[PDB]
Amino acid sequence: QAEILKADAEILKAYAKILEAHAEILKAQ
Amino acid sequence: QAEILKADAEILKAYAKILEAHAEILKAQ
Amino acid sequence: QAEILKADAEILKAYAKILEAHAEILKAQ
Amino acid sequence: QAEILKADAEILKAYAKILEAHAEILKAQ
Amino acid sequence: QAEILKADAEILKAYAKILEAHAEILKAQ
Amino acid sequence: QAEILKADAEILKAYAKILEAHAEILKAQ
Amino acid sequence: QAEILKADAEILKAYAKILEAHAEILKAQ
Amino acid sequence: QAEILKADAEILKAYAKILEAHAEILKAQ
Amino acid sequence: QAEILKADAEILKAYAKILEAHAEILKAQ
Amino acid sequence: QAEILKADAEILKAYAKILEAHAEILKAQ
Amino acid sequence: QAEILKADAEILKAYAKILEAHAEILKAQ
Amino acid sequence: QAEILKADAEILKAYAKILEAHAEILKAQ
Amino acid sequence: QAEILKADAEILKAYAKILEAHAEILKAQ
Amino acid sequence: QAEILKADAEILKAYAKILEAHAEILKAQ
Amino acid sequence: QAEILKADAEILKAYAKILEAHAEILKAQ
Amino acid sequence: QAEILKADAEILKAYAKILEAHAEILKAQ
Amino acid sequence: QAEILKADAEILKAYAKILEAHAEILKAQ
Amino acid sequence: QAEILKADAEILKAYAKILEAHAEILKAQ
Amino acid sequence: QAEILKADAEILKAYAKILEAHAEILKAQ
Amino acid sequence: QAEILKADAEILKAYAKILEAHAEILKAQ
Amino acid sequence: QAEILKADAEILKAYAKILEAHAEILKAQ
Amino acid sequence: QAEILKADAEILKAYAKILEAHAEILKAQ
Amino acid sequence: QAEILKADAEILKAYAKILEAHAEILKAQ
Amino acid sequence: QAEILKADAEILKAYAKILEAHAEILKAQ
Amino acid sequence: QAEILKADAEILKAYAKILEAHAEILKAQ
Amino acid sequence: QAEILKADAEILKAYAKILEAHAEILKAQ
Amino acid sequence: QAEILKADAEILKAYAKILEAHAEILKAQ
Amino acid sequence: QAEILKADAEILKAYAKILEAHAEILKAQ
Amino acid sequence: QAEILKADAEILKAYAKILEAHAEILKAQ
Amino acid sequence: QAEILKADAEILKAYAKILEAHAEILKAQ
Amino acid sequence: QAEILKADAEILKAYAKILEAHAEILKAQ
Amino acid sequence: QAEILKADAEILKAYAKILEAHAEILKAQ
Amino acid sequence: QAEILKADAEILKAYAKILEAHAEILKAQ
Amino acid sequence: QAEILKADAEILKAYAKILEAHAEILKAQ
Amino acid sequence: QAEILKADAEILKAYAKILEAHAEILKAQ
Amino acid sequence: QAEILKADAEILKAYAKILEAHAEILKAQ
Amino acid sequence: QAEILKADAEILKAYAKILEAHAEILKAQ
Amino acid sequence: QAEILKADAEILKAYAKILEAHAEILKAQ
Amino acid sequence: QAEILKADAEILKAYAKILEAHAEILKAQ
Amino acid sequence: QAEILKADAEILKAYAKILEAHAEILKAQ
Amino acid sequence: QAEILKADAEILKAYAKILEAHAEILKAQ
Amino acid sequence: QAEILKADAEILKAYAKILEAHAEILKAQ
Amino acid sequence: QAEILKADAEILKAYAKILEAHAEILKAQ
Amino acid sequence: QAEILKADAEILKAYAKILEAHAEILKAQ
Amino acid sequence: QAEILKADAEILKAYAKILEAHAEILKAQ
Amino acid sequence: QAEILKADAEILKAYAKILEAHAEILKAQ
Amino acid sequence: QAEILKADAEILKAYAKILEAHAEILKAQ
Amino acid sequence: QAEILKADAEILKAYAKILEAHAEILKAQ
Amino acid sequence: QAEILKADAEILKAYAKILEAHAEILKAQ
Amino acid sequence: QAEILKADAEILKAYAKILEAHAEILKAQ
Amino acid sequence: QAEILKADAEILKAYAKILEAHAEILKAQ
Amino acid sequence: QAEILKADAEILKAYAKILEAHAEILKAQ
Amino acid sequence: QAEILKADAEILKAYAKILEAHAEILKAQ
Amino acid sequence: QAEILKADAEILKAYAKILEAHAEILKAQ
Amino acid sequence: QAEILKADAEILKAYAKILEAHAEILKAQ
Amino acid sequence: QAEILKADAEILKAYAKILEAHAEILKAQ
Amino acid sequence: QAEILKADAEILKAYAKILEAHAEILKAQ
């Protein structure tokens, strides 16, 4: 099951990346 | 059943890949 | 019934393959 | 009835085959 | 009634055969 | 699981970044 | 976990910044 | 944790600032 | 923690200011 | 006993819906 | 007893729907 | 009793729908 | 009692629909 | 026992919904 | 035992909902 | 045992809801 | 053991609610 | 162990409620 | 240990309630 | 240790109740 | 130590009750 | 020491009860 | 007094329902 | 007083329903 | 007072329904 | 006294329900 | 006394429910 | 005395519930 | 004496519950 | 004496609860 | 004497609770 | 003597509580 | 003698409380 | 003799209280 | 002899009270 | 003095209860 | 003084209840 | 003072209830 | 002060209910 | 202050209800 | 502040309802 | 801020309803 | 009114006569 | 009224006659 | 009324006759 | 009334006969 | 009444026969 | 009554037989 | 009654057999 | 009764076997 | 009874085994 | 019984082992 | 019993070890 | 107030008159 | 206020008059 | 306010007048 | 506000006038 958990971890990491990228774009605006 | 679980794991991995790729594209924009 | 379950497993595996392939194409774009 | 179940299993197997073949074609594109 | 059930089983078997044959043709394309 | 926790941490960090950036924009207005 | 806590701290700091900025704007009005 | 506490302190300080500013406006009215 | 306490003190001071200002307005009416 | 035959008819109607959906696919192409 | 015959008619109508769907497929080609 | 005959007529109408669908197929070719 | 005769007429009309469908087939050829 | 066949029909209807959704996808393209 | 098959059908219906949502995405683009 | 499969279906339905929400986002843009 | 998978599905549903709320934000703009 | 994951989901749901409230704010403006 | 995470979620939910109340204020204006 | 965080959340919830009451005032006007 | 923070929260809740009562007054007018 | 703060909160709650009673009076008029 | 007549009308309506049911029987034959 | 006449009309309408049901019988024959 | 006349009209309409039902009978013969 | 007549009407309505159920039986055959 | 007749009607309604259930059986066959 | 008849009706209703349950069984098959 | 009949009805209702549970079993299969 | 029959009914109801629990088990599988 | 039968019913109810708990276990898995 | 059987039922209920607690454990995992 | 069995049941209930507490621990983690 | 078993149960209940307190500790952390 | 075991249980209960007090301390912090 | 009028109202309410009970009687007949 | 008027209103409400009960009687007839 | 007017309104509402009951009577006739 | 006006509105609403009841009477005639 | 205006609107709505009831009267005539 | 305007709109809507009721009167004549 | 404009629109819509009601009056004449 | 009742009695008598005559005819068949 | 009751008695007698005659016919079949 | 009761008795007797006749027919099958 | 009771007895006897006959048929299968 | 009891006895005997016959069939499977 | 008891005994015997047969089947699996 | 007791004994014996068989299967896993 | 006791003994023995088997499995993990 | 006691002994032995095994696992962690 | 006592001894020994192992882990931290 | 005592001794020894280890950690802080 | 009391007296006198008149009528019956 | 009381007195007097008049009419019947 | 009270008095006087006039009319009938 | 009150007084006076005038007309009839 741990594989599922680490998959979730990578999911959330990517989500955070999307968030901070949108943040950088907002900062550029 | 464990085969189903690892299938799900690979599913979510691919989903995370899609997410981070869309994130990289957003970053390029 | 287990045959049905492993059939489902292969289904989901193929679905994940489709997903990651679409992801690679998105990455190429 | 089990015959019906294994018929379903073969159905789903063939469906998965169609899926992964379409996936390979998508990959070729 | 069981005769009806096994008839259905053969039906679904033939359907699966049609499916996998169409799949092989798709693979050839 | 700790990976999930640190993912959450990065999430919240990014959220705080969004917040303070919106704050800086409000300050500019 | 402490990382989560300091993330929260930064969150609340940003919130306070938003608050005092809104306060400065109210003062300007 | 003390960081959280001082964050709270700054929060409440900003709140007091909002309060006294609203008070000054009320006084002007 | 004392910072929190003095924050509270300033809070209550501002509240008293609001009160006496409302009182002065009532007196003007 | 008739309800058994009702279930059989349900089986067959399901199969019919399968074929109808297959036609829907093919028409969609 | 008649409801038994109703179920029989339901069987037959299901079969008819099967054939109709098959025609739908063929027409769609 | 008449409802029994109604069920019989339903049987026959189902058969008629079968033949009609067969004609639909053949016409579609 | 007449409703019995109505059911009889329904029988006959069903048979007529059968023959009509047969004609439809033959015409379709 | 019939409820077992009801479950079988449910299986098949699910498969039909799968195919229908696949058609929906393809039509959407 | 049938409830097991009900669960299987639930699996398949879930997969169908997945595909339907994917179509919804693609249509939305 | 079937309840295990119910949980699996719940997993998949959750994933479907994820994709549906993603579509909701994209449509909202 | 299944309840573990229930918790996993809860994780995923939470993530879905996150995305849905994000869409709600974006739509609100 | 699953209850740990329940707590994780609670974390995420809390974050979702945060975002939802943020949307509520923005909509209110 | 999980109860610690429960407390964290409580922190976050409190923050969410803060934002919700802020929205309530703004809506009230 | 978690109870400390519970107390922190209590602090924040108190602050939220403050803001909510402020909104209640403003709405009452 | 946490009980100290509990007392702080009690302070704040008291202040909130003050404001709520003030709103009660104003509403009563 | 915290009990001192408890007494302070008691002071404030008393004041709140005063204001609440004043509102009760005014409402009673 | 009128309610007495209402009861009389109820009597008559009951009798009418009797006759209607008798007709239902006869029609059913 | 008029409600008395309403009851009378109810009597008559009941009688009418009687006759109508009698006609229903006779028609059914 | 007019409602009295409404009741009278109701009487007459009831009588009309009586005659209409009588006609229904006679027609049915 | 009228309630006595209400009970009589209840008797008759019960008898009507009897006849209606008898018709239901006969129709079911 | 009327309540006696109510009980009689209850008897009859029970008998009607008996017949209705018998019809339910027969229909179920 | 009427309550005796109520008990009789209860007897009969119980018997009706018996038959209804028997129908439930048969339908379930 | 009637309470004796009530007990009899209780006996019968118990038997009915038995049959109902048996149906529940069979349906569950 | 009736209470004896009440005890008998209790016996039977217990047996019914047994069967119901058995069904609960089987359904749970 | 009846209380003896009450004890017997208690025995049986205990056994039922045993089976119910067993089902609870199995469901929990 | 019956109290002996009561004690037996107590034994069994204790065993049931054991199993229930075991289920509680397993669910908790 | 029965009291001996009561003591036995007490033993078992104690064991059950042990297991319940163990579950409480595990849940607490 | 039974009181000996009561003492044994007391031993076990004490042990259970030990474990419960241990859980209380762990939860408190 | 049993009283010896009672004393043992007293020992254990004392130890439990120790642990409970330790938890009380830790909770108090 | 008002309490005298309260007693008067009690008198009247008693009389009303008398009439209501009389109606209860008459309805019961 | 107002409570006197409350008593007066109680008088009147009692009278109203009287009339209402009288209506209840008359309706019951 | 307002409560006096509340009592007046209570007087009037009582009178209204009187008239309403009078209407109830008249309607009942 | 506003509550005084609320009482006035209550007066007027009472008067309105009076007139409405008067209309109810007149309509009832 | 706005609640004062709410009370005014309540006054006016009451007056409107008065006029509406007057119309109800006149229409009823 | 907006709620003040809401109250104003409520005033106006009340006036509109007044005029509408006046029209209702006039139409009723 | 937008909600302020919503209130303005509410004002205007109220005025529109006023004019519409005036038209209703005039049309009614 | 009693005249109406005896009219009803004669009605039902005639109905019973019709019933038993139809019964005699059924017996002759 | 007793005339109505005996009319009902004769009704039910005739109904029983119909029932037993239908029973004799069923027996002949 | 006893006439009604004996009518019911004959009703139920005839019903039992129908039941046992249907039983004899089932036995012949 | 005893006639009703013995009627019920014969009813239940016939029911038991039906049951054991169905049992013999099941045994033959 | 004893006749009813022995009827119940025969009922339960037949039920047991059905049970053991179903058991023998299960054993044959 | 003893007949009822021995009927119950045979019931439970058959139930035990079903149980041990299901056990033997489980053992064969 | 002893027959009931030995029936219970056989019940519990069979239950123990089921338990140990499930145990042997668990051991095989 | 001793048979019941030894049945319980075998029950608990089997339970202990299940426990130690689960223990061996835990040890293998 | 001693058999029950030794059963309990084996129970507790197995429990201790589970405990020490969990302890060894904790030690390995 | 001594077997129970030594079982308890082994229980407590294992508990002490768990304790000292947790202690060693705490020491490592 | 002495085994129990030495078990307790080892318990308390381990407890003292936990205490002094916590003490060493406190000393390190 | 005494006027109210004598009014009540006359009320009750009239009520008694109604009662004795109804009594005389009952006596005439 | 006394004017209100005497008004009530006259009210009740008139009510008594109505009562005794209705009584005289009942006496005439 | 007294003006309102005397208005009420005149209201009730007029109501009493209406009552006694209706009473005189009833007396004339 | 007193102006509003006296307006209400005049309102109620006029209402009483209407009432007594309607009363005089009723008296003339």
Residue numbers in the entry:
A (entry chain 5), B (entry chain BA), C (entry chain HA), D (entry chain NA), E (entry chain TA), F (entry chain 0), ...: 101 to 129
J (entry chain d), K (entry chain j), L (entry chain p), M (entry chain v), N (entry chain X), O (entry chain R), ...: 1 to 29
Original paper wording:
Here we report seven high-resolution cryo-EM structures of filamentous peptide nanotubes based on a cross-α supramolecular architecture that provide insight into the designability of helical peptide filaments. A structural interaction is identified based on an appropriately placed pair of arginine residues (RxxxR) within the corresponding peptide sequences. This local interaction motif, designated as an arginine clasp, is robust within the context of these cross-α assemblies and can guide the coalescence of helical protofilaments into structurally defined cross-α nanotubes. In contrast to most structurally characterized filaments based on synthetic α-helical coiled-coils, the chain axes of the helical protomers are oriented in a plane nearly perpendicular to the long axis of the assembly.
Each nanotube was derived from coalesence of three protofilaments derived from the dimeric protomer. Among all three structures, the helices within the dimeric asymmetric unit could be superimposed with only minimal differences. Structural overlays of laterally interacting protofilaments indicated a conservation of the interfaces between the three filament structures. However, the axial interactions along the contour length of a protofilament for the Form II-like assemblies appeared quite robust and comparable in energy and buried surface area to that of Form I protofilaments.
